[PDB]
Chain length 66, copies 6
Amino acid sequence: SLQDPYLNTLRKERVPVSIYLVNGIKLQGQIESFDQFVILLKNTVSQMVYKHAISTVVPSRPVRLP
Amino acid sequence: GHSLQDPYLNTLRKERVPVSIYLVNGIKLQGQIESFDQFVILLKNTVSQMVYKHAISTVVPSRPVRL
Amino acid sequence: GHSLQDPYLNTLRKERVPVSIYLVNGIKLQGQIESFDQFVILLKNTVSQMVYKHAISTVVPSRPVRL
Amino acid sequence: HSLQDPYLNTLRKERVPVSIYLVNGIKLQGQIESFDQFVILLKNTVSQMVYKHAISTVVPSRPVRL
Amino acid sequence: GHSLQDPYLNTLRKERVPVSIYLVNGIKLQGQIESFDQFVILLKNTVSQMVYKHAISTVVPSRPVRL
Amino acid sequence: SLQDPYLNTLRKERVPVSIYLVNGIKLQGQIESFDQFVILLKNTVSQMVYKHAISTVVPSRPVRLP
């Protein structure tokens, strides 16, 4: 449950986010779309990020919560 | 099943106990548990963050808890 | 729940778009996506290698693509 | 769980001191207070909830009779 | 589903093509595939070793193959 | 299906094995027992190794295969 409304709010409002991968790498951009397994992260070009490789999704400003 | 995980996280959420969450990569997160589901935890401070359970090694409350 | 993953990989495949695949350990693989299923991706170049999805962190096209 | 459960339960019942090695090399020490399918509650200086997916090996300080 | 993984590993096993298997920790194994199931691959050489799929990042054949 | 008879052979024949973990650590010993999720690796003190943390199991000698 929770993931969906939270990611959807980030998508809809085009909130800049930081995504930390399980290996410590930080990606930055905005959530273009997502499904059950992946997130499409936009910047220069989009990239498909697998959820299994993500540790934390951190928005740049406070957002409405589920 | 989740017979220990849920009441433990729920108690920490209800009582607003500050926690430390250690990730598998050694990074330490701090805050209060806002809510959780079977896959993620929403950790609160000025901005919340969504933490995937699969990346968590351990949850350490700042003070004692009891089921 | 592959409503995004499938069409996206399928588009990279059909258009033979050069991609970079980054593994969890930091290795960058380069090539084009020849095929894929629920668990693996067959990546072409000198030889075709089979990459397990569970090892992949990000897939990055060398040029923007349209869904 | 034909091996995992009675092994963890015996450690718990007999209060055996254990070392838990995490996949990232970190060693936790303590007493097994409780566990379910996914986590172990590790007691001492303060309790902590350890996710099994992060554990590589459980090493008791003395052998246990199953 | 397994509609790419199984035929690919089976082709490798049947043709006895030597492969390199890279693990997520960066170690490289080499051998021929003797058999496999949903979870493990039996990798042959001096002795046969059992490799869990979850620890594998890529399988690289020594020469290219027909699917 | 392949895992079980293979593990069973190593056990009942008491073949010494090296077990490599996903972090590169090597464990040595004999397989006392196992279930769907863990392997009990016997020696000095037994230790319960989680399957999710194992990369490869290597017998010290060739064994009959399934």
